[PDB]
Design a protein around this ligand. Sequence first.
Ligand SMILES: CC(=O)N[C@@H]1[C@@H](O)[C@H](O[C@@H]2O[C@H](CO)[C@@H](O)[C@H](O)[C@H]2NC(C)=O)[C@@H](CO)O[C@H]1O
Length: 540
Amino acid sequence: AAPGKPTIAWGNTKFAIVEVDQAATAYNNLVKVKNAADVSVSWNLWNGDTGTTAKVLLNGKEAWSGPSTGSSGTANFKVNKGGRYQMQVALCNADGCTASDATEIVVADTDGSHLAPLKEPLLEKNKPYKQNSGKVVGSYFVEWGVYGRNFTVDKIPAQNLTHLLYGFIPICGGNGINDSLKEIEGSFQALQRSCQGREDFKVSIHDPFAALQKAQKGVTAWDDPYKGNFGQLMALKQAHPDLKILPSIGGWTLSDPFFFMGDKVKRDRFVGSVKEFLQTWKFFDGVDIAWEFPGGKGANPNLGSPQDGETYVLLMKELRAMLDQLSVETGRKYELTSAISAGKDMIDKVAYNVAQNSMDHIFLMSYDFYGAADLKNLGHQTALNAPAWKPDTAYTTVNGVNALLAQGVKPGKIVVGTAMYGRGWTGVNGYQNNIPFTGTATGPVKGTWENGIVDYRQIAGQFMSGEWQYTYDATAEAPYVFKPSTGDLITFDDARSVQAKGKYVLDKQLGGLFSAMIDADNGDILNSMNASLGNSAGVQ
Ligand SMILES: CC(=O)N[C@@H]1[C@@H](O)[C@H](O[C@@H]2O[C@H](CO)[C@@H](O)[C@H](O)[C@H]2NC(C)=O)[C@@H](CO)O[C@H]1O
């Protein structure tokens, strides 16, 4: 007669192709990429003949076979594709095969193939839009926003984006390489710990707890291998396979290492580490280069060289070549983008007419034009045009776009930036004709999280009532609020100024809109970005 029906033993059923060491702070030890997951199953036979061959089936297909030598057995085998499998043990002899009931096993991989889709309802004022304009709708999500700001990946209005950028991936390096980090308490030391045993100029993860280990919605079970931002982003990819999720390398305080990549030895090491990063973290769709900035004038006053423009073009070309090779190895399309200064002086340090041939999108940082770092020259921080009281204003969105177009950049490459926050001053005084910008300030406005910067959510929630004046400058296309008693003045984007940017993008056939940072919106800004670009309301 055929063998008795085996009973699968109680045991671990969760396995991982990319393993995460739960007691490691160094990135080199934190993650172990394998070619396949090591899977184990055991069984008992409580009634009958144990057969002569035992097999482990996954969805009916044999993954392991061996002699059946007793009433209990154990099988160890490899599974090289992530997902969920109906696993059975079968005992076979000449008279037949008898299969156990199925037990589901989970084989994790960093594409999120093991995860249920993270499809969360829209929050606050966010309304559903379909991505049918063909325009970029992008936003940056910051790794540290999960702490005080409490803004996690499940709160991203993901259906209302084409591009979600993750800020920020650091480049390893200690003294002289990441000195800008020393201005943030504990941050330099955190990077050195992540990069222990890891060569300078390879990428790493700045906050592995936030990125991979903090419990979050959908990834709370202790043996879920990927938690934190990355685990949730994997599940988000399962819900939105057309969403492009890009890691952004650099930003204000992690840009110092770019200034050394004129040395091709370092540049080659960096590019190879980016390829390895994308082979490790499969939910990412490319790379964003947020080098602030070629030529200097970023966080570090001691960095910046006339060579930087050439280094930038070489970097984009070599990144594109690496991504093209990754693309044909995987069958996937990979994107290369960059966040760049919107000032004409800065733009003309780089030959974007050449670099554009390597790049899918240029994220034009048409914001932070003015702020509390200068208390004497006040202006709109993210306006489309110059205001009427100073038509020669240098730093406007249009002047940045025009600088790119004058180089020969194709307009469809250019993604215009919107601000989900205000910048502002306190004690504004000595202004003429009821225009506070013509005065001077005594300090920064009190911020939501940092001096001089206010979340748009708080502008809308607190500074659009009481004594606060509200004015929409229709020449510049820029709103501002002013508290006369204290001289508090805040410049920001609102639904109308975003609408002007979106219409301007359509009229000039630019690439779309993007924002920083997604956590600071209440929905008004992203709603207007979508509507003004012609995205249809509703869900597709
Ligand atoms: C061009 C641009 O994006 N804006 C610059 C600001 O980033 C910069 O302020 C700095 O902003 C960073 C985040 O973007 C912060 O991490 C950093 O603490 C902050 N540093 C400051 C306020 O000194 C300012 C600095 O003058 O320049 C803008 O142009």
